[PDB]
Amino acid sequence: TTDGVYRVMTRGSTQVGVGVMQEGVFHTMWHVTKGAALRSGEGRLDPYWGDVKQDLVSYCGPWKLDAAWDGLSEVQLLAVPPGERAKNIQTLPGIFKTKDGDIGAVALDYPAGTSGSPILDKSGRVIGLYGNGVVISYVSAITQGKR
């Protein structure tokens, strides 16, 4: 239940994604788990909230992450690729311009099992999750939920 970044694994074992544990709630992207329950050691994590359009899902309680890109500063992707230790990748986001407002985006292309990796601001707050995007090269929205 410890705060941190976790791999999401399936059963040989494969990494299907990544998620963020914070305040006893596990956060990942809907397309990683499709809402399935997760095993954590001898414990079980059950889905609590989810939304396909936002491509987000929380386990054991409501979404907790609320920081947002400031629109000027570089950010770090805390990538956790399959078979590699977690690593920080710094970048200046671009922008998804939509009809309901702008969303930060990062033009970083990591393996699919990296989906759900957190994106951080300078204070270490999670401003969203990596792995829902478009192709121009892949560009990921910085996907954040509502607390």
Partner: protein, 40 residues
């Protein structure tokens, strides 16, 4: 189908981090299935 999680690290900013990637400005639409698409 056993889906399970393993801790990989703390969430922290690292001063010594690799820096890469450009910053494209893109018009996109988001449909009901959560898929982004380019718009012109």
């Amino acid at each position: 189908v056993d889906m399970y999680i393993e801790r990989a690290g703390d969430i922290t900013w690292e001063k010594d981090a690799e820096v890469t990637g450009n910053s494209p400005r893109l018009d996109v639409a988001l449909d009901e299935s959560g898929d982004f698409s380019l718009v012109e």
